[PDB]
């Protein structure tokens, strides 16, 4: 499992992963990716 | 926002919140509650 939340800083619609991943790393998470249907940027890190 | 993940220890279908909240506190989260449709026990804590 991972601990997950929505990015505070990622702007725009989440289309591809790397821009979201990078925003999430800037927010002190280890990764990020797009939510499937709503296209939010979700940040993840170890619990 | 909070950081959220699925409980490792909560047994059974999540029907009511307090049993899930208790399991999540035992896993070093600050709260927990039932996922709406799938009835998982989800734990939460500050990011
Ligand atoms: C009956 C409808 C049910 C409503 C409630 C259904 C639940 C709900 O509304 O929230 C999310 C849902 C889909 O969310 P979306 O795909 O954006 O986000 C995913 C969703 O949150 C999953 O639950 C996550 O898995 P988990 O849980 O972390 O394991 C998954 O994380 P990951 O796997 O990507 O890491 C996320 O990507 O959004 C809609 O259904 C909009 C319906 C559009 C219109 C529908 C109706 C007009
Ligand atoms: C257009 C329809 C497509 C989207 C349909 C809806 C698709 C969808 O995303 O549902 C999620 C469902 C499990 O969702 P479930 O309700 O168990 O869990 C919720 C889900 O994780 C939300 O995204 C969370 O909010 P957030 O994101 O953290 O803010 C919410 O957290 P909280 O608020 O409790 O803390 C959780 O309770 O997983 C499936 O998709 C397969 C089931 C299929 C269900 C229906 C399919 C027949």
Author numbering:
A (entry chain C), B (entry chain A): 1 to 47
What do the authors of the reporting publication say about this deposited model?
NaD1, a plant defensin isolated from the flowers of the ornamental tobacco (Nicotiana alata), exhibits potent antifungal activity against pathogenic fungi, including Fusarium oxysporum, Botrytis cinerea, Aspergillus niger, Cryptococcus species, as well as the yeasts Saccharomyces cerevisiae and Candida albicans. The plant defensins are small (∼5 kDa, 45–54 amino acids), basic, cysteine-rich proteins that display a family-defining disulfide bond array (in a CI–CVIII, CII–CV, CIII–CVI, and CIV–CVII configuration) known as the cysteine-stabilized αβ (CSαβ) motif. This motif consists of a triple-stranded antiparallel β-sheet, which is cross-braced via three disulfide bonds at the core of the molecule to an α-helix (in a βαββ arrangement). NaD1 inhibits fungal growth in a three-stage process that involves specific interaction with the cell wall and entry into the cytoplasm before cell death.
The structure of monomeric NaD1 was used to solve the structure of a NaD1:PIP2 complex by molecular replacement and refined to a resolution of 1.6 Å with values of Rwork/Rfree of 0.155/0.184. Upon PIP2 binding, NaD1 forms an arch composed of 14 NaD1 molecules, with a final arch diameter of 90 Å and a width of 35 Å. Fourteen PIP2 molecules are bound in an extended binding groove on the inside of the arch. The observed NaD1:PIP2 oligomer can be described as an assembly of seven NaD1 dimers, which comprise two distinct NaD1:NaD1 interfaces. The first interface is formed by an antiparallel alignment of the β1-strand from each of two NaD1 molecules (monomers I and II) and exhibits two-fold symmetry between the associated monomers. It comprises an average buried surface area of 430 Å2 and is formed by a network of six hydrogen bonds involving R1, K4, E6, E27, K45, and C47. This dimeric arrangement leads to the formation of a ‘cationic grip’, which is able to accommodate two PIP2 head groups simultaneously. NaD1 binds PIP2 primarily via a ‘cationic grip’ that is created by a NaD1 dimer, which results in the formation of a distinct binding site formed by K4 together with residues 33–40, which comprise a characteristic ‘KILRR’ motif. PIP2 forms a dense network of hydrogen bonds involving K4, H33, K36, I37, L38, and R40 of a single NaD1 monomer. Bound PIP2 forms additional hydrogen bonds with R40 from monomer II and K36 from monomer IV′, with the full PIP2 binding site in the oligomer comprising contributions from three different NaD1 molecules. Examination of the PIP2 binding pockets in the NaD1:PIP2 oligomer suggests that R40, which contacts two adjacent PIP2 molecules simultaneously and interacts with the phosphate moiety at position 4, is critical for cooperative binding of PIP2 and therefore formation of the NaD1:PIP2 oligomer.
